[PDB]
mmCIF file with all atom_site columns, all heavy atoms in Angstrom:
data_model
loop_
_atom_site.group_PDB
_atom_site.id
_atom_site.type_symbol
_atom_site.label_atom_id
_atom_site.label_alt_id
_atom_site.label_comp_id
_atom_site.label_asym_id
_atom_site.label_entity_id
_atom_site.label_seq_id
_atom_site.pdbx_PDB_ins_code
_atom_site.Cartn_x
_atom_site.Cartn_y
_atom_site.Cartn_z
_atom_site.occupancy
_atom_site.B_iso_or_equiv
_atom_site.pdbx_formal_charge
_atom_site.auth_seq_id
_atom_site.auth_comp_id
_atom_site.auth_asym_id
_atom_site.auth_atom_id
_atom_site.pdbx_PDB_model_num
ATOM 1  N N   . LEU B 1 48  ? 14.046 18.959  28.007 1.00 44.14 ? 48  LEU B N   1
ATOM 2  C CA  . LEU B 1 48  ? 12.863 19.165  28.809 1.00 44.14 ? 48  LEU B CA  1
ATOM 3  C C   . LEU B 1 48  ? 12.983 18.557  30.163 1.00 44.14 ? 48  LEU B C   1
ATOM 4  O O   . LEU B 1 48  ? 13.922 17.737  30.365 1.00 44.14 ? 48  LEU B O   1
ATOM 5  C CB  . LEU B 1 48  ? 11.694 18.533  28.036 1.00 44.14 ? 48  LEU B CB  1
ATOM 6  C CG  . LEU B 1 48  ? 11.384 19.030  26.620 1.00 44.14 ? 48  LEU B CG  1
ATOM 7  C CD1 . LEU B 1 48  ? 12.001 18.106  25.622 1.00 44.14 ? 48  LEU B CD1 1
ATOM 8  C CD2 . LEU B 1 48  ? 9.945  19.281  26.329 1.00 44.14 ? 48  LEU B CD2 1
ATOM 9  N N   . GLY B 1 107 ? 42.840 24.657  36.828 1.00 60.10 ? 107 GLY B N   1
ATOM 10 C CA  . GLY B 1 107 ? 44.179 24.040  36.729 1.00 60.10 ? 107 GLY B CA  1
ATOM 11 C C   . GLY B 1 107 ? 44.303 22.654  37.046 1.00 60.10 ? 107 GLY B C   1
ATOM 12 O O   . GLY B 1 107 ? 45.160 22.212  37.883 1.00 60.10 ? 107 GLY B O   1
ATOM 13 N N   . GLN B 1 131 ? 37.842 28.495  18.349 1.00 50.50 ? 131 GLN B N   1
ATOM 14 C CA  . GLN B 1 131 ? 38.902 28.126  17.404 1.00 50.50 ? 131 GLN B CA  1
ATOM 15 C C   . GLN B 1 131 ? 38.793 26.709  17.075 1.00 50.50 ? 131 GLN B C   1
ATOM 16 O O   . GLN B 1 131 ? 38.944 26.302  15.927 1.00 50.50 ? 131 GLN B O   1
ATOM 17 C CB  . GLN B 1 131 ? 40.203 28.522  17.820 1.00 50.50 ? 131 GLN B CB  1
ATOM 18 C CG  . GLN B 1 131 ? 41.334 28.133  16.822 1.00 50.50 ? 131 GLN B CG  1
ATOM 19 C CD  . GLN B 1 131 ? 41.405 29.209  15.603 1.00 50.50 ? 131 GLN B CD  1
ATOM 20 O OE1 . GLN B 1 131 ? 41.193 30.440  15.877 1.00 50.50 ? 131 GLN B OE1 1
ATOM 21 N NE2 . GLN B 1 131 ? 41.500 28.688  14.445 1.00 50.50 ? 131 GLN B NE2 1
ATOM 22 N N   . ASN B 1 139 ? 39.032 -0.360  18.086 1.00 66.02 ? 139 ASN B N   1
ATOM 23 C CA  . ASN B 1 139 ? 39.316 -1.788  18.310 1.00 66.02 ? 139 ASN B CA  1
ATOM 24 C C   . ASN B 1 139 ? 38.057 -2.628  18.196 1.00 66.02 ? 139 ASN B C   1
ATOM 25 O O   . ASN B 1 139 ? 37.161 -2.270  18.949 1.00 66.02 ? 139 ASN B O   1
ATOM 26 C CB  . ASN B 1 139 ? 40.121 -2.052  19.584 1.00 66.02 ? 139 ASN B CB  1
ATOM 27 C CG  . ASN B 1 139 ? 40.763 -3.385  19.677 1.00 66.02 ? 139 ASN B CG  1
ATOM 28 O OD1 . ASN B 1 139 ? 40.886 -4.011  18.649 1.00 66.02 ? 139 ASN B OD1 1
ATOM 29 N ND2 . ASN B 1 139 ? 41.116 -3.804  20.927 1.00 66.02 ? 139 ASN B ND2 1
ATOM 30 N N   . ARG B 1 165 ? 31.576 -37.244 20.968 1.00 70.57 ? 165 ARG B N   1
ATOM 31 C CA  . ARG B 1 165 ? 31.865 -38.645 21.287 1.00 70.57 ? 165 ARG B CA  1
ATOM 32 C C   . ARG B 1 165 ? 30.761 -39.473 20.948 1.00 70.57 ? 165 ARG B C   1
ATOM 33 O O   . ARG B 1 165 ? 30.987 -40.716 20.640 1.00 70.57 ? 165 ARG B O   1
ATOM 34 C CB  . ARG B 1 165 ? 32.283 -38.652 22.758 1.00 70.57 ? 165 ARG B CB  1
ATOM 35 C CG  . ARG B 1 165 ? 33.678 -37.976 23.035 1.00 70.57 ? 165 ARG B CG  1
ATOM 36 C CD  . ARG B 1 165 ? 34.206 -38.464 24.381 1.00 70.57 ? 165 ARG B CD  1
ATOM 37 N NE  . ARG B 1 165 ? 33.341 -38.170 25.528 1.00 70.57 ? 165 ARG B NE  1
ATOM 38 C CZ  . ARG B 1 165 ? 33.382 -37.083 26.288 1.00 70.57 ? 165 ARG B CZ  1
ATOM 39 N NH1 . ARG B 1 165 ? 34.358 -36.074 26.046 1.00 70.57 ? 165 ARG B NH1 1
ATOM 40 N NH2 . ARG B 1 165 ? 32.529 -36.879 27.252 1.00 70.57 ? 165 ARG B NH2 1
ATOM 41 N N   . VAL B 1 170 ? 28.986 -44.034 17.351 1.00 70.24 ? 170 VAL B N   1
ATOM 42 C CA  . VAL B 1 170 ? 28.000 -44.741 16.634 1.00 70.24 ? 170 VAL B CA  1
ATOM 43 C C   . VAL B 1 170 ? 28.249 -44.590 15.160 1.00 70.24 ? 170 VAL B C   1
ATOM 44 O O   . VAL B 1 170 ? 27.360 -45.022 14.429 1.00 70.24 ? 170 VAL B O   1
ATOM 45 C CB  . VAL B 1 170 ? 26.629 -44.300 16.958 1.00 70.24 ? 170 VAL B CB  1
ATOM 46 C CG1 . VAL B 1 170 ? 26.394 -44.504 18.493 1.00 70.24 ? 170 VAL B CG1 1
ATOM 47 C CG2 . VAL B 1 170 ? 26.382 -42.838 16.698 1.00 70.24 ? 170 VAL B CG2 1
ATOM 48 N N   . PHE B 1 185 ? 39.908 -19.990 10.663 1.00 72.89 ? 185 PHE B N   1
ATOM 49 C CA  . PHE B 1 185 ? 40.169 -18.549 10.702 1.00 72.89 ? 185 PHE B CA  1
ATOM 50 C C   . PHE B 1 185 ? 41.236 -18.249 9.514  1.00 72.89 ? 185 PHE B C   1
ATOM 51 O O   . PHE B 1 185 ? 42.391 -18.198 9.671  1.00 72.89 ? 185 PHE B O   1
ATOM 52 C CB  . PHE B 1 185 ? 40.940 -18.238 12.090 1.00 72.89 ? 185 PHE B CB  1
ATOM 53 C CG  . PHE B 1 185 ? 40.874 -16.761 12.355 1.00 72.89 ? 185 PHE B CG  1
ATOM 54 C CD1 . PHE B 1 185 ? 40.728 -16.273 13.675 1.00 72.89 ? 185 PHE B CD1 1
ATOM 55 C CD2 . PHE B 1 185 ? 41.167 -15.740 11.402 1.00 72.89 ? 185 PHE B CD2 1
ATOM 56 C CE1 . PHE B 1 185 ? 40.830 -14.979 13.979 1.00 72.89 ? 185 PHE B CE1 1
ATOM 57 C CE2 . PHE B 1 185 ? 41.155 -14.461 11.672 1.00 72.89 ? 185 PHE B CE2 1
ATOM 58 C CZ  . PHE B 1 185 ? 41.006 -14.031 12.961 1.00 72.89 ? 185 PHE B CZ  1
ATOM 59 N N   . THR B 1 270 ? 40.110 -18.928 30.062 1.00 75.75 ? 270 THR B N   1
ATOM 60 C CA  . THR B 1 270 ? 39.578 -18.549 31.276 1.00 75.75 ? 270 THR B CA  1
ATOM 61 C C   . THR B 1 270 ? 38.397 -19.351 31.866 1.00 75.75 ? 270 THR B C   1
ATOM 62 O O   . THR B 1 270 ? 38.310 -19.649 33.007 1.00 75.75 ? 270 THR B O   1
ATOM 63 C CB  . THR B 1 270 ? 39.242 -16.976 31.384 1.00 75.75 ? 270 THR B CB  1
ATOM 64 O OG1 . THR B 1 270 ? 40.433 -16.255 31.411 1.00 75.75 ? 270 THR B OG1 1
ATOM 65 C CG2 . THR B 1 270 ? 38.234 -16.636 32.539 1.00 75.75 ? 270 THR B CG2 1
ATOM 66 N N   . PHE B 1 282 ? 43.922 -21.152 12.420 1.00 72.61 ? 282 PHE B N   1
ATOM 67 C CA  . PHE B 1 282 ? 44.402 -20.082 11.585 1.00 72.61 ? 282 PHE B CA  1
ATOM 68 C C   . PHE B 1 282 ? 45.304 -20.587 10.440 1.00 72.61 ? 282 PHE B C   1
ATOM 69 O O   . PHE B 1 282 ? 46.239 -21.288 10.665 1.00 72.61 ? 282 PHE B O   1
ATOM 70 C CB  . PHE B 1 282 ? 45.213 -19.097 12.459 1.00 72.61 ? 282 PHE B CB  1
ATOM 71 C CG  . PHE B 1 282 ? 45.657 -17.780 11.633 1.00 72.61 ? 282 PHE B CG  1
ATOM 72 C CD1 . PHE B 1 282 ? 44.683 -16.675 11.630 1.00 72.61 ? 282 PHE B CD1 1
ATOM 73 C CD2 . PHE B 1 282 ? 46.727 -17.675 11.093 1.00 72.61 ? 282 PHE B CD2 1
ATOM 74 C CE1 . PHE B 1 282 ? 45.079 -15.534 10.928 1.00 72.61 ? 282 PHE B CE1 1
ATOM 75 C CE2 . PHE B 1 282 ? 47.108 -16.495 10.369 1.00 72.61 ? 282 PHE B CE2 1
ATOM 76 C CZ  . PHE B 1 282 ? 46.262 -15.485 10.234 1.00 72.61 ? 282 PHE B CZ  1
#
Side-chain angles (χ1 to χ4, degrees):
Chain B
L48 305 97
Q131 183 75 42
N139 194 16
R165 292 196 301 265
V170 303
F185 196 144
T270 280
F282 183 90

